[PDB]
Design a binder for this molecule. Structure first.
Ligand SMILES: [Fe+3]
Ligand SMILES: [Fe+3]
Ligand SMILES: [Fe+3]
Ligand SMILES: [Fe+3]
Ligand SMILES: [Mg+2]
Ligand SMILES: [Mg+2]
Ligand SMILES: [Mg+2]
Ligand SMILES: [Mg+2]
Lengths: 308, 307
């Protein structure tokens, strides 16, 4: 049976790790040959989930073409967020919930994206469509993904489908989703032993907005001041990235997960576009984004319109 | 509120009927959809529409003047779509082509399956939503599958397509083989067609790496009838190659009885057809044994050859 690799985006989050694991499980339970893998380091939030449900981290890879011919993408599509040698392999399927850009195939494929709050919400449907029992631990990881992406059902990307899936997955996993999820989210918001290099990369994604090359990085925190007091050090590593990668904009989005508000730190030639996007005045490279917590819903589309 | 649902430029039976079907499903679910088309209805589609007593969808050139959001069926690439696609939101795509030249600013419902017909996906979606398919609509959907599968003979045809057609022909009340052979024959009637119509009725533009390509297909029961018209075909094809700055125009003339096609290749990259299919062009043509499907047997090998 031909082996495939299943993985999500660089700088993996809980949905990208757990959805890779769950989809590989669903493929293997159906008699196929899948290995879930990851493209970077496991963050504290994901590690809490993996540890709680006694699951291993997926194997770390840098490339796929040395290993297999065919891959499945979960939780992303854009080339520049994917494995570095993505053009050397065939993308067989994509299960996702981001916007689509920078994605092309030579041949028809199974592309399944729904505008829902979490990729694992789609995978939940797929288990059922295929009449495969979701094991307790798998359900736990899928629930983790949903709580992560929805910030415990508070993010505006969260839909009724995500809430229903989480309800099913929590009963199967044997946990209280509120209690568990609060602890899980807090594990990811622990910024104590985090360097600024880590802060600006742990949840970084690159985009091309029109002709403009952009990186948007997000940080979950229980206290914006703890991050903001590192501003000079953050500006230094972000500046290095802006130069190195020839970005028109690096936007760091520092999210208060308790208040659902974010502080923007914008660096690069196109910083003033953030002002247009959000109707704010940047003062010393920062501004308050009231209510903004979702990159896919509240940052990418308005920043696209502003940049163009 | 209002949305428009349509398929590609140079509409085929799947593009017309799937737009009709999905609008019906949306409206039965209480939404507000109208199926539209981006060009002339071909003789095969017209057979289907006439047989199941259904009108042709309204022809449109633009969408942004009418609605804010659209749904694409049976295509995704920008240059295959409505003139002003950049001005509207793509809310959903239901499709079975390769993906290229397609970007959205926000998440969407993107649903592609590598099956033989878009209508096979829609059949599934009616069931998922517990909505009955009306007899006429089932016939249009059946027509789409027969059209795209060349009566289940094309290598794009899967067990799912066959199962959908079986259910649909039963709902519609027709013998699928009998009706299908007649429908297909109506599309292969090249008796009143100009050469301009031959190279355009089932034409699609692609970007193959850095190369600008147009691939047109025609159904025939007699390749010699079309090959008789080579000089005239080369005249109109060359015009297009110049006007659109194409690296290649590939005309695929398909014997639907024998499942073989004749290629007519014009353009600076004509020799890449020779690499793609391991054939030699003699007077711009070569027999492509077994080749009937653009999405599966043409676009991928031609992409490889050209890069
Ligand atoms: Fe993610
Ligand atoms: Fe996600
Ligand atoms: Fe079509
Ligand atoms: Fe089609
Ligand atoms: Mg996430
Ligand atoms: Mg995220
Ligand atoms: Mg077709
Ligand atoms: Mg076709």
């Amino acid at each position: 049976m031909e082996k495939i690799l299943i993985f999500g985006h660089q700088n993996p989050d809980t949905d990208t790790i757990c959805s890779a694991i769950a989809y590989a499980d669903l493929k293997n339970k159906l008699g196929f040959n899948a290995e879930p893998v990851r493209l970077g380091q496991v963050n504290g939030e994901t590690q809490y989930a993996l540890d709680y449900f006694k699951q291993e981290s997926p194997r770390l890879v840098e490339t796929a073409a040395n290993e297999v011919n065919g891959v499945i993408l979960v939780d992303h599509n854009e080339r520049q967020q994917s494995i570095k040698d993505i053009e050397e392999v065939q993308v067989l399927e994509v299960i996702d919930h981001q916007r689509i850009a920078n994605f092309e195939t030579a041949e028809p494929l199974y592309y399944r994206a729904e505008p829902v709050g979490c990729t694992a919400t789609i995978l939940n449907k797929m288990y059922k469509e295929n009449n495969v029992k979701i094991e307790k631990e798998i359900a736990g990881l899928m629930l983790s993904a949903i709580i992560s992406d929805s910030l415990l059902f508070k993010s505006p990307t969260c839909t009724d489908q995500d809430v229903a899936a989480a309800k099913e997955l929590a009963e199967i996993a044997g946990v209280d989703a509120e209690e568990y999820g609060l602890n899980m989210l807090k594990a990811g918001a622990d910024l104590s032993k985090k360097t600024v290099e880590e802060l600006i990369s742990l949840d970084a994604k690159e985009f091309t907005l029109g002709s403009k090359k952009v990186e948007i990085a997000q940080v979950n925190t229980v206290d914006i001041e703890d991050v903001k007091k590192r501003q000079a050090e953050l500006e230094a590593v972000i500046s290095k990235v802006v130069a190195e990668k020839n970005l028109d904009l690096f936007l760091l989005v520092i999210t208060d997960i308790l208040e659902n508000d974010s502080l923007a730190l914008a660096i690069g030639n196109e910083a003033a576009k953030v002002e247009k996007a959000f109707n704010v005045t940047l003062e010393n490279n920062t501004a308050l984004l009231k209510g903004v917590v979702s990159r896919k819903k509240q940052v990418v589309p308005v920043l696209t319109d502003a940049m163009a």
